[PDB]
Amino acid sequence: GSHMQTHAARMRTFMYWPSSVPVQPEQLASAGFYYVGRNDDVKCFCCDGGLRCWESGDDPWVEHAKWFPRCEFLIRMKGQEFVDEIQGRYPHLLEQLLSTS
Ligand SMILES: [Zn+2]
């Protein structure tokens, strides 16, 4: 429950990635991108860790299920079904190490 989804924000993410979104923007709106993401590098709303990296006609969802450490927004039908499946495929989903001293 934050107000980063009002004021203009909604259309502040509805912009684009190259110069228009030739992906599936109706699915993006469910994945937390395009209007439903945040700014340019569609960060998402509830997500603590959303980004974009669009590979080869990939879904917004596998992208937005491989870097999110949490997306309470999307933890609903995706986070109990998606990831339950996606994590089946991703045994390196969880946090590894980085600069942990
Ligand atoms: Zn998210």
Curated annotation (Swiss-Prot):
Q: Report the family membership.
A: Belongs to the IAP family.
Where do the BIR repeat units fall?
Answer: 7-74
Originating species: Homo sapiens (Human)
Report which superkingdom the organism of origin falls in. Answer: Eukaryota
Question: Which compartments is it annotated to reside in?
Answer: Cytoplasm; Nucleus
| Subunit architecture | Interacts with DIABLO/SMAC and with PRSS25; these interactions inhibit apoptotic suppressor activity. Interacts with CASP9. Interacts (via BIR domains) with TRAF2; the interaction is required for IKBKE ubiquitination. Interacts with E2F1, RIPK1, RIPK2, RIPK3, RIPK4, BIRC5/survivin and USP19. HSP90AB1. Interacts with UBXN1. Interacts with GSK3B. Interacts with several death receptors, inclusing FAS, TNFRSF10A and TNFRSF10B. Recruited to TNFRSF10B in the absence of receptor stimulation. When TNFRSF10B is stimulated, further recruited to the receptor and cleaved by caspases.
Official protein name in the record: Baculoviral IAP repeat-containing protein 2
Residues noted as binding Zn(2+) in the record, renumbered to the chain: C44, C47, H64, C71
> After translation, how is this protein modified?
Auto-ubiquitinated and degraded by the proteasome in apoptotic cells. Upon stimulation of death receptors, including TNFRSF10B, recruited to receptors and cleaved by caspases. Proteolytic fragments remain associated with the receptors. This cleavage presumably inactivates the protein.
**Notes concerning its domains:** The BIR domains mediate nuclear localization.
Please describe what this protein does. Answer: Multi-functional protein which regulates not only caspases and apoptosis, but also modulates inflammatory signaling and immunity, mitogenic kinase signaling, and cell proliferation, as well as cell invasion and metastasis. Acts as an E3 ubiquitin-protein ligase regulating NF-kappa-B signaling and regulates both canonical and non-canonical NF-kappa-B signaling by acting in opposite directions: acts as a positive regulator of the canonical pathway and suppresses constitutive activation of non-canonical NF-kappa-B signaling.
The gene name reads BIRC2
Q: What is the reported tissue distribution?
A: Present in many fetal and adult tissues. Mainly expressed in adult skeletal muscle, thymus, testis, ovary, and pancreas, low or absent in brain and peripheral blood leukocytes.
